[PDB]
A paper describes a structure:
The uptake of glucose against its concentration gradient is mediated by the sodium-dependent glucose cotransporters (SGLT). These transporters utilize the electrochemical gradient to drive the uphill transport of glucose and play essential roles in human health. SGLT1 (SLC5A1) and SGLT2 (SLC5A2) are two important subtypes of this family, and their physiological functions are well-documented. Pioneering structural work on the bacterial homolog vSGLT from Vibrio parahaemolyticus revealed that SGLT proteins have 14 transmembrane helices, which assemble into a LeuT-like fold.
To visualize the substrate-bound structure of hSGLT2, we supplemented methyl alpha-d-galactopyranoside (AMG) into the hSGLT2GFP-MAP17nb protein in nanodisc. Subsequent single particle analysis generated reconstruction of the hSGLT2-AMG complex at 3.33 Å resolution. We observed that AMG is bound in an occluded substrate-binding site and we modeled the AMG into the density according to the structures of the vSGLT-galactose complex and the hSGLT2-empagliflozin complex. The structure and conformation of the hSGLT2-AMG complex are overall similar to those of the hSGLT1-4D4FDG complex. We did not observe densities for sodium ions in these structures, likely due to their low resolutions. MAP17 is an essential subunit for the glucose uptake activity of hSGLT2 but not hSGLT115. Because MAP17 interacts with TM13 of hSGLT2, which is part of the less-mobile region that shows little conformational changes between different states of the hSGLT2-MAP17 complex, the conformation of MAP17-TM13 also stays the same. In agreement with this, we found similar structural changes of the Na2 and Na3 sites in hSGLT2, even though the Na3 site of hSGLT2 is not functional, indicating the Na3 site likely enhances the sodium and sugar affinity thermodynamically.
Author numbering:
A (entry chain B): 28 to 55
B (entry chain A): 26 to 46, 60 to 194, 199 to 574, 641 to 672
Write the structure that this text describes.
């Protein structure tokens, strides 16, 4: 099922972006 | 012929009217970027490698997406704040000395001769060869004549119409191809049976074909391949091609020249977003039509026997690259096939116009002023035109090398050549932009060492040659087995290490010469030492572009995951 793995990729990329913005707002 | 004649009349009229009679909005900038990148070379290469390998090649274009936003978010502020017209001028300002600037300009020019112009000329040549049934060299001559006519008349608003025409033509082609095969599920349910019925090879050199690569690859559907077993491994994609695309977008003169004309930083960012969204599209619009051509015409595309391949294309290793031209020759209706060739010529013309302008602003400005500090404007324009003519003839002369390389397919040749010489420039630019410690000679020696190692690994490639399963190339496995993107990563890392080693062991550069020329000091209000703009964005538009960039990244990652 391509759609489920695409959604998983979206979720992991969203977590990555959230972490990146969190460290950006923490370390300025 | 009527459609082609009408399009030529439109081009001549537009050029004549333009001849007779820095604040660009986001959409014209994005269209200019897309038209500068996308050309006949991209279509031919993607279709050919999709016919040969599969969708993995399309993952290259999708990796050109991410870097663009970096280009729009990391290196564009430095380029605008430094007031650098070109890329070598930036390193002239930051490092100093006329040796690094001159050499980097020359290396960029060579990367142009065997990465941009030659491939586009060969792609137009194969288009005319498939459509008009001519010889390859005669097709090159015809393409040279028509491109000279186009440059004389058309020359340079136009970006938007060029992109719209290209996208419309490609969308029409994919629409008529998917129903020809039966749809997306039609292509995916019948691709693996595209094996040809001709595996004889009457020449006693190989006899019966090994029956290993005439069939489509078992992992052709998957976008991500095995790290060592599969061709185009995912380490060689995600890390291998980011380095090359850094040079392509964030460091090459073509993209920055087409990008420095934005109205402001926000407009540049929005244009980058539009270019990335348009970069989602060319996967569906190129790689899948190549599989269409493979399915409908397997014997004429997936040939492996040297005799039939020489009959079809003139090359015994290739003929996978005629996937796209043949497709528009037969699949499209009889009344059509003029609009498709018009679209292909439009993409080629946009790419060549951008390349010619960038080569002129590189050689005519950097080298000529370094040699002739003061000259007339007419002399400068004449130098630019002569440089364009010379660069075109040099690429035409280099085209026979492009004819047969990297297994007979063109886009793999582009990736291989660009994986050998770009990573030095990528490492030098990254170190200059993010490492203040680097000096002029610290970067120069690392750059020249990277060039030497790249040339040492590159000379066997066009010396021994390349071949398919029928006749594999005779070269050591140690110096050939490693993928060109793996070698790109390794050379990038060793060049970075060499540059850092030379810099930390030699006299540094004072900070007073390093204002607004480094990403860590974009907002510094102090004065510069003159070793030889004014970016701003209101919060509302900045946050709007930030959120739409996040959404665009989400879409790109979704399509990455969806195709494994
Ligand atoms: C010629 O352009 C092609 O190859 C370069 C690397 O050379 C990629 O960055 C780009 O996405 C692709 O379209």
């Amino acid at each position: 099922q391509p759609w489920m793995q695409g959604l998983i990729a979206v979720a992991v990329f969203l977590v990555l972006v959230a972490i990146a913005f969190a460290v950006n707002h923490f370390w300025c | 012929i009527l459609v082609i004649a009408a399009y030529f009349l439109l081009v001549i009229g537009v050029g004549l009217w333009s001849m007779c009679r820095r604040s660009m909005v986001w959409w014209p900038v994005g269209a200019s970027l897309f038209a500068s990148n996308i050309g006949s070379g991209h279509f031919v290469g993607l279709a050919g490698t999709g016919a040969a390998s599969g969708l993995a090649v399309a993952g290259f274009e999708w990796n050109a997406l991410f870097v663009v936003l970096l280009l729009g978010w990391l290196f564009a502020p430095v380029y605008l704040t430094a007031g650098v017209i070109t890329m070598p001028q930036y390193l002239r300002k930051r490092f100093g000395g006329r040796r690094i600037r001159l050499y980097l300009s020359v290396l960029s020019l060579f990367l142009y001769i065997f990465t941009k112009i030659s491939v586009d000329m060969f792609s137009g040549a194969v288009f005319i060869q498939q459509a008009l049934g001519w010889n390859i060299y005669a097709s090159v001559i015809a393409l040279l004549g028509i491109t000279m006519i186009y440059t004389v008349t058309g020359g340079l608003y136009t970006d938007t119409v060029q992109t719209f025409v290209i996208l419309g033509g490609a969308c029409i082609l994919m629409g008529y191809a998917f129903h020809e095969v039966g749809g997306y599920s039609g292509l995916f349910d019948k691709y693996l049976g595209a094996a040809t019925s001709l595996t004889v090879s009457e020449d006693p050199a190989v006899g019966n074909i090994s029956s290993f690569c005439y069939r489509p690859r078992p992992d052709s559907y998957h976008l991500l391949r095995h790290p060592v077993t599969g061709d185009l491994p995912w380490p060689a994609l995600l890390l291998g091609l980011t380095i090359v695309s850094g040079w392509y977008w964030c460091s090459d003169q073509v993209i920055v020249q087409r990008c420095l004309a934005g109205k402001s930083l926000t407009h540049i960012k929005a244009g980058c977003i539009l270019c990335g969204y348009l970069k989602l599209t060319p996967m569906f619009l190129m790689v899948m039509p190549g599989m269409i051509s493979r399915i409908l015409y397997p014997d004429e595309v997936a040939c492996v026997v040297p005799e039939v391949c020489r009959r079809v294309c003139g090359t015994e290793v290739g003929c996978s690259n005629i996937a796209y031209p043949r497709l528009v020759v037969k699949l499209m209706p009889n009344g059509l096939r003029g609009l498709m060739l018009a679209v292909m010529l439009a993409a080629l013309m946009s790419s060549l116009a951008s390349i010619f302008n960038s080569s002129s602003t590189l050689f005519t400005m950097d080298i000529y002023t370094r040699l002739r500090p003061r000259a007339g404007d007419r002399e400068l324009l004449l130098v630019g035109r002569l440089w364009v003519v010379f660069i075109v003839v040099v690429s035409v002369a280099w085209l026979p090398v492009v004819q047969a390389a990297q297994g007979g397919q063109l886009f793999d040749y582009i990736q291989a050549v660009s994986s050998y010489l770009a990573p030095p420039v990528s490492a030098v630019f990254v170190l200059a932009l993010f490492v203040p410690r680097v000096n002029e000679q610290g970067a120069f020696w690392g750059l020249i060492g990277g060039l030497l190692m790249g040339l040492a690994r590159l000379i066997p490639e066009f010396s021994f040659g390349s071949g398919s399963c029928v006749q594999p190339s005779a070269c050591p496995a140690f110096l050939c087995g490693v993928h060109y993107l793996y070698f790109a990563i390794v050379l990038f890392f060793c060049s970075g290490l060499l540059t850092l080693t030379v810099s930390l062991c030699t006299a540094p550069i004072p900070r007073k010469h390093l204002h607004r020329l480094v990403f860590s000091l974009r907002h510094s209000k102090e004065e510069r030492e003159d070793l030889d703009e004014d970016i701003s964005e209101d919060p509302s538009w900045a946050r709007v572009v930030n959120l739409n960039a996040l959404l665009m990244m989400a879409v790109a990652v979704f399509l990455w995951g969806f195709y494994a």
